[PDB]
Design a protein around this ligand. Structure first.
Ligand SMILES: Cc1ncc(-c2nc(Nc3ccc(C(=O)NCCN4CCCCC4)cc3)ncc2F)n1C(C)C
Length: 348
């Protein structure tokens, strides 16, 4: 509960989605503000329970100012068999970047520069841990009243190798969100690295520059059409790496098209901004700038400090996730993460 005689007081609901319900709250004894995420009926759906487990493990591993942090995870208050809803206490973030972009709030070039900086700073750290987010978009980038940006929602994250047991190994065109989905996922190019995230970053960057989505495709083919209208026809090497014959045949059926310069896509936009944008939005994963190299780009020189943009050591281990687990075994694993959270706090 959250009554006068409990640790937390609920203020108001700030988010309702597939993740559960996020509320603003205060620690009653101190007045300190936090977010509390309720994950209702957390063990009912296997897919959802697996997302919960991998987020708990990843967020416990990370300690970085541009990644959402777990402050507490509430222990069960009922017998083990009746425990059904998980409560996670996190940094309070009043808004997301989607809200900000698509509102009457100011979003000057300097806002874009500062938000992009923070996003990339978080990514350098996450990517050095061998974690790919795979669902970066403005609604997963949280922004607080101090103008601090933190990356959230690690339910779709994976490492540098995913298991053949799960459907997303083969059905890569369904990974995450259409408008931000990297060409390698759309086309099954069999090259799945941290570059996935840099594509999404490019889309987010463009979206901040114009305050409208860069590639808002209505379906699979239309999404590819919109991307090719700017990037041009993909190379013979990329076309040959397309997993599916129909997709490869469809791309070959279209007439040749050269790239449109980013200066034409975004008239009058900042030169250095467009320079960096062009380094992110490439068909070839290996052609894209890394998060680390992006932080060294002239566009971000204002905020860049190589003494204060850390990597993460040791790297994150996804071994736990490749295991074929039942509902009850996943529940046990989640309860163990809660126990371990508190056991580690007792031993510091
Ligand atoms: C998955 C997750 N786990 C923990 C958190 C988390 N979230 C917040 N704050 C939030 C959460 C949601 C909203 C919101 O829904 N705003 C309305 C507009 N929104 C526009 C984009 C489409 C969705 C609707 C605002 C602030 N603070 C701390 C946290 F740890 N999250 C977030 C990313 C939802």
């Amino acid at each position: 509960t959250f009554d006068v005689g409990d640790e937390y007081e609920i203020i108001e609901t700030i988010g309702n989605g597939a993740y559960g319900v996020v509320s603003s709250a205060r620690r009653r004894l101190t007045g300190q503000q936090v977010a509390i995420k309720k994950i209702p009926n957390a063990f009912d759906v296997v897919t959802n329970a697996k997302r919960t487990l991998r987020e708990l493990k990843i967020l416990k591993h990370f300690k970085h100012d541009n990644i959402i942090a777990i402050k507490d995870i509430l222990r069960p208050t009922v017998p083990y068999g009746e425990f059904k809803s998980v409560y996670v206490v996190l940094d309070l973030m009043e808004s997301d970047l989607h809200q900000i972009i698509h509102s009457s709030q100011p979003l000057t070039l300097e806002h874009v520069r500062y938000f992009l900086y923070q996003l990339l700073r978080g990514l350098k750290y996450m990517h050095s841990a061998q974690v790919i987010h795979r669902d970066l978009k403005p609604s997963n980038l949280l922004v607080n009243e101090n103008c601090e940006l933190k990356i959230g929602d690690f339910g779709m994250a994976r490492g540098l190798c995913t298991s053949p047991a799960e459907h997303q190994y083969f059905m890569t065109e369904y990974v995450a969100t259409r408008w931000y989905r990297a060409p390698e996922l759309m086309l099954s190019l069999h090259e799945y690295t941290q570059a996935i995230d840099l594509w999404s970053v490019g889309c987010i960057f463009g979206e901040m520059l114009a305050r409208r989505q860069l590639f808002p495709g209505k379906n699979y083919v239309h999404q590819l059409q919109l991307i090719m209208m700017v990037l041009g026809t993909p190379s013979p090497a990329v076309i040959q790496a397309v997993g599916a014959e129909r997709v490869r045949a469809y791309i070959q059926s279209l007439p040749p098209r050269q790239p449109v310069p980013w200066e034409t896509v975004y008239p009058g936009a900042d030169r250095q901004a467009l320079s960096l944008l062009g380094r992110m939005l490439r068909f070839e994963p290996s052609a894209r700038i890394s998060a680390a190299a992006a932080l060294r780009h002239p566009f971000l020189a204002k905020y860049h400090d190589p003494d204060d943009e850390p990597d993460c050591a040791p790297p994150f281990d996804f071994a736990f996730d490749r295991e074929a687990l039942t509902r009850e075994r996943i529940k046990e694993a989640i309860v163990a993460e809660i126990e371990d959270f508190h056991a580690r706090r007792e031993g510091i």
